[PDB]
Amino acid sequence: AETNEITIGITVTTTGPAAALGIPERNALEFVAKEIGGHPLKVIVLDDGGDPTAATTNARRFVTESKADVIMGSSVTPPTVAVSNVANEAQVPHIALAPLPITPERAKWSVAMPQPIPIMGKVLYEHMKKNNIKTVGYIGYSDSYGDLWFNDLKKQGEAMGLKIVAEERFARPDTSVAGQVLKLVAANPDAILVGASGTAAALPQTSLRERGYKGLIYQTHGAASMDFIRIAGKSAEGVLMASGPVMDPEGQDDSALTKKPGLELNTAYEAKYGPNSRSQFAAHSFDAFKVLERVVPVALKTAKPGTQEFREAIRKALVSEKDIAASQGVYSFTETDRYGLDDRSRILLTVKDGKYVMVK
């Protein structure tokens, strides 16, 4: 088994609540390379509905039925963890499209495109300090994503002089967070960090304001699309939100390596879907292909697509190829840094009169 095409399996969430993340990821595939080194790319896209069991099945199908050289996904963290388990057992390179906890068992075959939590937390906690915030409450998912954030707030947050005074959790599918909001408003912190994503991110935003909270609200990069503003409406005003720089390529210097790729994606996306349809999420799948454009030609020098040797050559190329410019950042993976990002990979956003504005 050795082939002319390079086979890429993608599992993303295009049904259910997390479709707010996976649909732009799928849509961005219209604008990525169709061939690398003259080899056509065979891209198989499967929905997982956000479910780790479905993601596990899809990922294994890509290995066994499709003989994939690279697997990508998923849209949210629990199925992403599942994909990483399969990829590490099968020895297939995996580009994660949601943040996930890198452990030793996942590090060999997995890299991640979204900004790591600590890089995003740093920009949020610094703004807190600069705005005279001393006490902070947290509301987030009762799963690995909500844990990543809470654990960072506690470690980074306390170390630069923030006090956590309240912690509440909710489940992704929950339609109400009334109970949690009552306890947060009762604690009355200066600021609240919401550890959520997509549509669910807007539920604490609206409930907190409707319940009369008047402190600062901070949101994570999981919330970084126009849909958050659509859902939260006036309650989104003054929110502070971590995002990738693809949200504002126009505001970047021509010397930013992120600028040309951001403009390429946004011009394509917004030509089809309209002004200000850009998102954090479209950029991740687009950027995964930018990485492949760098690493696949290296692997082609020494190995045939469809072979374990090719999979191994991609794995080694991910670490040997430095400074891969993409829309969301400049990636330099190492054997221990599976995200490969630095300060060029984030900006801080606020919302003013219903639009995103960069906090300068």
Ligand SMILES: O=C(O)/C=C/c1ccc(O)c(O)c1
């Ligand atoms: O819901 C989650 O599990 C996290 C989702 C998430 C968070 C940050 C990103 O950049 C992204 O594409 C997805």
